[PDB]
Design a protein around this ligand. Structure first.
Ligand SMILES: [Cl-]
Length: 542
């Protein structure tokens, strides 16, 4: 297994372009890179489980023919290279067919989450100017309210009404030719159109050169091997699914699994057993549902997973430990963004220290820094904002949002807006902002002040204070304390500690809730990861 230190010293963008079938300056096509270049052995590329739990396996050859059929269908419908085809589709081979087909004629694929309201679709069509959208009969009504909805291709079951102006997707594609010459494109040219989530929606244009980053993550971080059976749980409506459930594995020529069925824990354990899954990837939301199933449910599948990859949320330390004890597999924290792909990981494919509370190391091909308030590079354990050094990161593909401006790009940096801090060995530790307060009934409360108050009591060896949401009060002050030996964690003690804060601090700052715990989540240096305590209180309300 490659040493990570070596992989950093030996990185060279040309070595990464060598892994492509094409070349981002001479000519490249994503369908070639994720499909045609692996035909010739009739080996399986897509293991798909339908809503009635029937298995379909499809070779790269099979995908090529679907890709070509769709490419013709789109071309005849008016799609030229550089236009946008949107997909409002569940997780079925026809979803993949639509993507590889769009890529085959140099078009741009735009994913549309199957649960988007009409309003949220119209916003995303406005960003993309999609010339065509693919959906099935079930989601066809949602597209009826969209003011700027381009032509629709409807996937129909046997003998169903096709809408007035729509294309009969299954009929056009079955009647289309299997010969479709893939259009050549430049690296700078786009094949994906993503959008941001829940902050104001901006377009994220993904150029074809991003394939290098995408393939790096699959190899260095997921550690996908040719002998792995890979299942990424996530939906291709969002970046992590589209980048690394569809594109990533195919990019490497490894089969990928798609489960049309809604996520449940027992269902996931079935798939893992039925298809021999050894490399599982997904979000913390999904993995906590597995933990909520119980150690018994996970017994029948313990020992099968080689590696688990988790993205979207730093993992609670207990979730890691549960995976090791209850599934015998190491779960690793991978951090990325819609804008970047993955950039900082605990890597399954490179040897490096995996320390509790660390996000890991910059993926080779990226140089990261922690920026001052002024944008100067701070030092180890000095807190700052995680930033990508634009130059010196050969794998970076994000050059700004599609139409709007990109204030996160200045001084030669792209700023993640996430608060972190580097460890002397080079690790990244997510730290959370030190300028942060709890507002409880209009009063602003510094958690540090409350913590200092608690620690002065002989029963309190360690304390961490966070704000739990409450509608009546906005937040309520909650303490997590590690008891000194000799003091029992009784409600009497809790009341005693609350009164003690009242007197030492103020009548407003005292903790209304006190949990006694054996440990607090910390970074490798000791800083308490209060945000992990806070998010667990938010999940408890859901
Ligand atoms: Cl079956």
């Amino acid at each position: 297994l490659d040493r990570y230190d070596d992989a950093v010293a030996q990185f060279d963008i040309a070595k990464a372009i060598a892994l492509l079938a094409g070349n981002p300056d001479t000519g490249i096509n994503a369908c070639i890179e994720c499909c045609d270049r692996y035909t010739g052995e009739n080996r399986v590329a897509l293991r798909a489980i339908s809503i009635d739990n029937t298995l379909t396996e499809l070779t790269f050859e099979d995908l090529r023919d679907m890709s070509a059929r769709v490419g013709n269908m789109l071309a005849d419908a008016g799609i030229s290279a550089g236009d946008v085809v949107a997909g409002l589709l569940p997780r079925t081979p026809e979803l993949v067919a639509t993507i590889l087909g769009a890529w085959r004629i140099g078009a741009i694929y735009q994913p549309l989450f199957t649960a988007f309201g009409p309003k949220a679709i119209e916003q995303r069509f406005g960003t993309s100017g999609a010339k065509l959208v693919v959906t099935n009969l079930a989601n066809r009504s949602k597209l009826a309210e969209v003011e700027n909805c381009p032509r629709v291709a409807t996937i129909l079951a046997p003998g169903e009404s096709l809408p007035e102006g729509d294309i009969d997707f299954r009929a056009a594609v079955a009647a289309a030719s299997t010969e479709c010459e893939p259009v050549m494109r430049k690296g700078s040219d786009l094949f994906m159109m993503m959008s941001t989530s829940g902050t104001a929606p901006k377009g994220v244009p993904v150029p074809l050169r991003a394939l290098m980053a995408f393939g790096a993550y699959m190899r260095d971080a997921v550690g996908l091997r040719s002998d792995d059976i890979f299942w990424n749980i996530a939906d291709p409506g969002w970046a992590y699914g589209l980048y690394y459930a569809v594109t990533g594995p195919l990019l490497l020529g490894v089969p990928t699994i798609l489960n049309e069925g809604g996520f449940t824990a027992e269902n996931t354990y079935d798939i893992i057993e039925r298809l021999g899954v050894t490399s599982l990837a997904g979000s913390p939301t999904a993995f906590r549902l597995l933990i909520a199933a119980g150690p018994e449910s996970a017994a029948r599948v313990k020992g099968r997973l080689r590696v688990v990859s988790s993205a979207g949320e730093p993992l609670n330390p207990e979730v890691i430990r549960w995976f090791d004890a209850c599934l015998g597999a190491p779960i690793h924290d991978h951090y990325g963004q819609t804008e970047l792909g993955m950039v900082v990981n605990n890597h399954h494919g490179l040897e490096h220290p995996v320390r509790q509370g660390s996000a890991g190391y910059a993926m080779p091909g990226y140089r990261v820094a922690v920026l001052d308030e002024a944008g100067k590079e701070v030092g180890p354990n000095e807190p700052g904002v995680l930033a990508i050094d634009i130059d010196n990161s050969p794998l970076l593909w994000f050059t700004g949002y599609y139409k709007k401006d990109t204030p996160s790009i200045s001084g030669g940096y792209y700023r993640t807006g996430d608060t972190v801090e580097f460890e002397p060995d080079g690790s990244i530790s997510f730290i959370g902002r030190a300028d942060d307060v709890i507002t409880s009934s209009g009063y602003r409360i510094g958690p540090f002040d409350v913590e200092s108050a608690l620690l002065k009591h002989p029963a309190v060896n360690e304390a961490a204070v966070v704000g739990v949401p409450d509608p009546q009060r906005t937040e309520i002050v909650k303490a997590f304390v590690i008891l000194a030996p000799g003091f029992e964690g009784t409600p009497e003690l809790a009341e005693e500690l609350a009164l003690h804060v009242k007197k030492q601090l103020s009548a407003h700052a005292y903790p209304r809730q006190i949990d006694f715990v054996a440990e607090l989540p910390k970074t490798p240096s000791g800083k308490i990861q209060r945000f992990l305590l806070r998010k667990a209180e938010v999940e408890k309300q859901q």
